[PDB]
């Protein structure tokens, strides 16, 4: 019925607003999975125009409108769950840009200190990255306290590198912390499931997994599995280009032997 309201309330809109209004009507199902940056790009308008339209429909902004749009459209298990994750792995392996991956490998190799940022289900992905970095002997820290991450990002200096782990690239405190590093000329690598988002303007490099999240599918295993695959490839490529990291894999494995039963 929010569609019914859009058509009905479309009467008073200017040309640019009606372009976006028309776009959303004809692409309702796909817009669930688009960021504000996507919708502005796809309509050839601006983010300011999208927001202005969402406000005219009664909403606080784009995220709020998209949430309503998702609820509006929504109105064997082991094998389906597994197949959906196999598909996303495959799709992600096709999408991976090898040249940006190779630059990212060199950035990590050169980094003295790696900070990672991510909340909600992205906290799982950022944790796996920091663990895998620690396995090869890098200093890495994962923050879900976005206040502490903003404060670290704000004093960041040559030698540091940041990963912003966010499927949507639209999470306010994650973007804020990442942007502080970016504005200081610190490399920021984003791990996302969407090509264009607010975070992309604040990233020096991006890896993109398959299956963008919508309002009702955050944390979906199909979206998270591709993001974890980005982490896996990155650290295995580091291991391949710099075999000396294998000494660290070995030593970190040895020192937790005394922690076994």
Q: Which is nearer to ligand BMX, 19 or 148 (CB)?
A: 148
Q: Contact 199/38 with Cβ under 8 angstroms?
A: no
Q: Is residue 49 a contact point for its own copies (CB under 8 A)?
A: no
Report what 71 binds from ligand BMX, its own copies, none; CB cut-off 5-8 Å by kind: its own copies
| Comparison of 169 and 187: residue with beta carbon closer to ligand BMX | 169
Tokens of 215: 């309002």
Query: How far apart, in Å, do the first and last CA atoms of the chain sit?
Result: 59
What would the two tokens of residue 258 be? Answer: 């005394």
Does 232 contact its own copies by CB under 8 A?
yes
* Choice between 45 and 190, CB closer to ligand BMX: 190
Kind plus residue range of the DSSP H or E element containing 177 = helix 172-183
202, 176, 177, 180: which is closest to 189 by C-alpha?
A: 202
Q: With CB cut-offs between 5 and 8 Å by kind, which of its own copies, ligand BMX, none does residue 51 bind?
A: its own copies
Q: Is 203 in the site for its own copies (CB under 8 A)?
A: no
Residue 78 or 259 with smaller CB distance to ligand BMX: 259
The CB-of-188 to its own copies minimum distance in angstroms stands at 16
Residue 12: closest CA among 48, 57, 45: 57
Beta bridge partners of 117: 143, 164
Q: How far is the CB of 192 from its own copies (least distance, A)?
A: 13
């Amino acid at each position: 019925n929010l569609l019914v309201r859009l058509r009905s309330n479309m009467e008073p809109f200017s040309k640019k607003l009606r372009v976006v209004a028309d776009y959303i009507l004809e692409n309702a199902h796909d817009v669930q999975f688009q960021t504000i940056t996507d919708l502005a790009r796809n309509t050839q308008t601006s983010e300011a125009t999208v927001v202005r339209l969402c406000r005219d429909m009664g909403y606080k902004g784009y995220s709020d409108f998209r949430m309503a749009l998702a609820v509006d459209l929504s109105q064997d298990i082991c094998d389906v769950s597994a197949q959906s994750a196999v598909d996303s792995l495959q799709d992600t392996a096709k999408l991976i840009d090898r040249k940006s991956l190779a630059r990212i490998v060199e950035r990590v190799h050169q980094a003295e200190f790696i900070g990672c940022i991510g909340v909600g289900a992205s906290s799982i992905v950022g944790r796996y990255l920091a663990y895998r970095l620690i396995r090869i002997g890098k200093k890495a820290i994962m923050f879900e306290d976005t206040h502490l991450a903003a404060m670290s990002a704000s004093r960041s200096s040559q030698g540091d590198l940041w990963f912003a782990v966010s499927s949507s690239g639209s999470t306010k405190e994650v973007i804020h912390a990442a942007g502080l590093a970016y504005k200081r000329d610190i490399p920021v690598v984003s791990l996302t499931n969407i090509n264009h988002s607010p975070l992309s303007s604040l990233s020096t490099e991006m890896l993109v997994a398959a299956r963008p999240e919508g309002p009702l599918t955050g944390g979906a295993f199909a979206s998270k599995v591709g993001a974890l695959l980005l982490v896996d490839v990155l650290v295995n490529s580091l291991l391949e280009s710099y075999p000396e990291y294998k000494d660290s894999v070995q030593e970190t494995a040895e020192v937790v032997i005394p922690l076994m039963a």
